[PDB]
Amino acid sequence: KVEYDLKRLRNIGIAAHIDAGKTTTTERILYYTGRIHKIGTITAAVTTCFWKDHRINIIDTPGHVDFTIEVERSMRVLDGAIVVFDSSQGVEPQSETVWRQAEKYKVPRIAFANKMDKTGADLWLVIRTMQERLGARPVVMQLPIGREDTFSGIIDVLRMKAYTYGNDLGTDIREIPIPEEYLDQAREYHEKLVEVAADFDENIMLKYLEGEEPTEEELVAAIRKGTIDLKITPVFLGSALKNKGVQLLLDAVVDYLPSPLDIPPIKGTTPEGEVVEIHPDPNGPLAALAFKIMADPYVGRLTFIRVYSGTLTSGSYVYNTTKGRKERVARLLRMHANHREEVEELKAGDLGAVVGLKETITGDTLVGEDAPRVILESIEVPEPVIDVAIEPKTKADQEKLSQALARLAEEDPTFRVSTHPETGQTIISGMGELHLEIIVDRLKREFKVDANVGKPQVAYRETITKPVDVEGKFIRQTGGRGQYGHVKIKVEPLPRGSGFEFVNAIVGGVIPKEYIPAVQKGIEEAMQSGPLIGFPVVDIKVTLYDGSYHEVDSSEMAFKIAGSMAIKEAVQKGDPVILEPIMRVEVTTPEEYMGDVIGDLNARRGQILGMEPRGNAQVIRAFVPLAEMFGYATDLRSKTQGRGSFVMFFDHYQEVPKQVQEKLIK
Amino acid sequence: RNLSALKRHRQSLKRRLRNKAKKSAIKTLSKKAIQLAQEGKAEEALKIMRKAESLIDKAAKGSTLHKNAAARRKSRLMRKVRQLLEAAGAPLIGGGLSA
Amino acid sequence: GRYIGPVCRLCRREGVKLYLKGERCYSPKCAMERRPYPPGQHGQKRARRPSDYAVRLREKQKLRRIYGISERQFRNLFEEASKKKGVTGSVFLGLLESRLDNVVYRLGFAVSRRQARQLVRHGHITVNGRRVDLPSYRVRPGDEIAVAEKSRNLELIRQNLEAMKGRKVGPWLSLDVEGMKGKFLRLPDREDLALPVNEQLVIEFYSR
RNA sequence: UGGAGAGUUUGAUCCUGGCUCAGGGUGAACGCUGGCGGCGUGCCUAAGACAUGCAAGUCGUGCGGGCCGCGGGGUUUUACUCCGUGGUCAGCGGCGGACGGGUGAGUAACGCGUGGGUGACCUACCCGGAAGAGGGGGACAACCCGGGGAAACUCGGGCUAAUCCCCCAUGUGGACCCGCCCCUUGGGGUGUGUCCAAAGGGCUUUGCCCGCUUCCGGAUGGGCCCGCGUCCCAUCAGCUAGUUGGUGGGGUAAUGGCCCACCAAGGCGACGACGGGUAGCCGGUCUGAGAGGAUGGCCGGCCACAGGGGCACUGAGACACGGGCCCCACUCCUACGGGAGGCAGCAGUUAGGAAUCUUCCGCAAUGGGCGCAAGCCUGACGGAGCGACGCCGCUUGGAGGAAGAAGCCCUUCGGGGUGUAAACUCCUGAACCCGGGACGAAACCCCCGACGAGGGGACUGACGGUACCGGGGUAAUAGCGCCGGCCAACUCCGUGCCAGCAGCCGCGGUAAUACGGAGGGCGCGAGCGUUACCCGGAUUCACUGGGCGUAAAGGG
């Protein structure tokens, strides 16, 4: 009554670029792994199945689309992966992206040739790209009986067994030996497999060069020994729609797809501070992670978790170290492709949902209620790319939008809400155009808030061009509290990035000692509302050189207006120039789309700075205004077909083209 | 899903249906009575009323009426009857009304 | 928990020598013997005149630090003596003295009260038979406070039960150095306790 | 057996006077810390909604069967398959589901509290007393057959039993109308008339046990009625038609406009009617010297409500929380023709909120329903779990040990402080280990007796291998507030009306005991602070215990 070996656990993820088949790939995985019949919706984050004595934990949701972050989190928590590929889309421009981000964490993955039955459906067409675009060492595991329309069956190279499909309803399959012709086409390949697999077992190498065939048991040993090293990428095939290449890709799983054991142990940190391997031991300290919270109308709040060490138990007591809380795990649950399996525990390496717990939000660490109060890794970093200007209509939808991101920032911490620290308006952070757009349906529908959707502002800077000298008097002598503060300065522009430089240039001291302090609060202060549009009149040097006083009428503040009347016109008489913020950037773009990327950067008011090769691409430096920068994530990803990404850092302020100076008078 | 206490409801209906009858009986009967009594049918009234009387106490046995419910009805029947037979009649036959 | 930490420090502050250490406090060094003055950085400076409050708080602490007891218990015991029929001053002391961990100190099975407690705590003590380990336990009139048997022969017990042969024990306690017994004759009286503490002030402390 | 004041209006004074603080309390939350145990206690908000599971049943000693396992087989063989007993399934009938458990929405009211009245009534089961249990008929499920349905179930024939129903008898005796007697609101008698009883089971079978019927009495539990007491607003002053009374009916266990008919104009109100706001009331709880002031959580009593609302049925009792009907709102199934529901029961889910627990173990004990018993049900209860939420007890060590290490701080640089503190030296030994290990449980039952007294015997532990006991046993968790005055406890450095503090007065603008850190100190200690709210201080709404010439206050 063991039932749990660990070496039978398969936690895979179906990640690929849109169109593909991911979803269709899974609703199918779960039909074969369980059609039982014996004489007796992605219903939740992660789901379990049993394929010939192995438990598989799948986390299908990827999508790839602009924003990933979900594809990359599941990936962490789970073992293997299947980058499903559209066999059809041959001149496929986005077959990419996905995989180039998987080894980016370090995880093994096979590839799937999906729509083999759809026009242009060519197997090699992909390997002729799967090694051309990304550069892996795939192994044509099968060959097609009839390309595209003539899709009857398929043949295993490694095992030289022929299979056929009498239909697409998934019923009349069978294994009929190789059909007359073909046959020969095989060999050469079943040797190349028994040749590639030689780079692993030197035992399948010698018997190759002697005249003996490697036993069906060790041959796979080579293939699998190395697949799991991230060296080989077993590519198979089959119309997920017509039920072909599936039940043979399900073997493709177990046989080469890692087990929780086969994978490199988690790192975390103790209360003191130091790394440590979280050993997948069903008897080591309890320490798992929580990723996807959910609201079940039947069991309330669910918290999906992946155990790395120890075992969780039904009717126990955990403790969230992240958010210092004694959560009470009251019941466990395993999501079955068609029902709720109420198990009694989650031994390390396994995953599921714990009914109960409250504070536990995305990626929290829970340890036994006494165990080393440690906190694992998790630390992912998918920041934003596309942001918007959301102004909540009257001061009414600014409260329907306040409780709009107080439940939409816990249910998705992959965005960033921040109030523009210069002009009210709040900025909704996104991971692409699709991210913010759909938050605009629910935050506008499921929250009934109806605010605004225009675009972000620019933090300009008032200033001048020519050095001027105006008077700074005040005097108000009617009889008493006089108010006598007179001054005269030397305001002169400085380089675009100087700041504020005041000069205490008075001879004998015609303006008292006590009164020059509060005369700097008038010049510094008054610089606030510019002489053009009204912005921070910076990048200038003040030089109080003159100005007189009175024995009684003068004040610690009468001199506050005196120096505030000298700055309030020295920038108006010295020709006021409306400067603006220029951001530095870098678009990692394949030099293939580099022609139209650097161009666009010019038809975008900017000037390019360089291109120093990087990897297989090339980075472009430059400066762009911020008015002419909005929605660039869907313009750069445009001139590059997704193969384009960029950064951005502030730099300096610079005058508007005299034509963007008579525009700003709004 | 359910509780076998409906046995109490089923029974309820019955018991209800039963005394619901002897109930209405004593009523109509009680009227047919006071009716004649006032009309003049001296002895042939008493007769009915003497019957009414039975039925009353009769139902008092079960859970229909009880205690004074019976007694009260009586004291009124043979009170309005006797107080209608003096509308010139002399209690002829030996009714319930005592000498 | 029973304070713990620098005591021949309190010995100071209060300025009225304390036997919180027992043996040592007698040698030319109860601390207060060498540096007779409030601890801290300042300590040896012209002390400002005590407020009407300071005085009473100070006298309370004094009395409380003697019996080394938490402010909570001290207060309860106080509040108890108050509602009790009899001159509250004496009565308060009455119970304070009944503390087992104290009757142990008095009967001499211990050098300090700090010690007497640890003894009582570790069941080295007994009451008319069964052993008690609650310092707070309150002795009645006519009880035998002996040392348990497993204890009888333990270095400490002897030495302490040794300096006894000769010395006398309070008029409300009869001790038998041999049988290591001891009766709580009558309830201690006012003078019997030559404490450098004025109760009338402590009383007035809890009057505010 | 009981009463403490202080800070703040002035240049200074006295008075009036407001603000503010020290105390105690809390179903508590928040912050920083957090070791053990015992006993308490834990949705104060949405009386918002709720997935799942369980919270009320039980008698074969009331009756007839269906199904299953035994006897002996009815007959000559299986036949018309009968019988006696032990499992079961539902149906009849019998009690119990009206108690127990939850909640405070409503309610200012005979709701509650208290003291009384019932010549105006009721009370299943339980005690004691009296007399009875005589004949007869009779249906409906169950069951068989047939029909409608998706389902829930439902309809139609035909059987059949009983403590189910019905008629006749006997009526100790009771119920009625009338008369007389005593009495005095309908209370007792008494005569004529009239009307009503009832059931059978088990055994050891002319004698018991459990039942039945009528009547009287007791006990317990109630209904209704009444005097008194029961918050804020007159910037709510007038209210009222079944309204107030009467007569006669109906109605009820019973009084009464509780209802209806018809008469009469009356009933209520500054002793605050009517209206509006708020609230469940009490025993008690907190505070207080007291008088008084708040309050009504847990425990006990009463009430009121079970999604909102109306209504009856059965019954001793309900207008019924896990009963019924209907309206409405919500949840679910649907073959869309119609169906099933009600956590303010236990546990849990979600929403709200600053905030309040396990979908736990046991019927061993107490208590309740049924039963002759055996026994069955029992989220009531007895326990365990989680939370310093509270209170009580306990540990983080004890005795030694320098004219006194180091580090750190202060310094007139002589030195002072931290301080016996550490170190170091012995000694006891929380934790933790092997071993032993309950009280709560002695009845129901069984045997003697007489199934009476009394005597003897047996089965019964969830907590729990827990508490506790003996042996073995390692020096083994401290924070938090404060340090200008009230108010215990000060120095240095940063800082420069900044940053910040702040309960009040106020502190901060280059030497700050007031900000920030440090050393040191004070208080208290598994706690310490903050925030709400109540009493106190506040004789500051003054009955105890104040005032009005100018302080607020005399009415033309």
Ligand SMILES: CC(=O)O[C@H]1C[C@@]2(C)[C@@H](C[C@@H](O)[C@H]3[C@@]4(C)CC[C@@H](O)[C@@H](C)[C@@H]4CC[C@@]32C)/C1=C(\CCC=C(C)C)C(=O)O
């Ligand atoms: C079910 C699944 O696995 O992914 C689904 C579910 C999905 C990942 C969704 C994309 C995106 O909303 C995702 C976000 C982060 C969107 C922002 C928030 O609302 C999150 C709470 C939400 C979590 C999952 C969700 C809602 C999916 C899509 C959407 C595709 C849309 C288009 C127009 C092609 C997908 O997978 O293609």
Ligand SMILES: Nc1nc2c(ncn2[C@@H]2O[C@H](COP(=O)(O)OP(=O)(O)O)[C@@H](O)[C@H]2O)c(=O)[nH]1
């Ligand atoms: N012809 C064909 N179409 C397929 C196959 N598998 C998937 N598809 C189609 O691919 C489209 C997108 O499938 P889906 O898995 O939802 O895309 P994903 O969300 O990017 O994984 C749908 O139209 C599917 O029917 C296949 O094997 N053959």
Ligand SMILES: [Mg+2]
């Ligand atoms: Mg998809």
Ligand SMILES: [Zn+2]
């Ligand atoms: Zn000393």
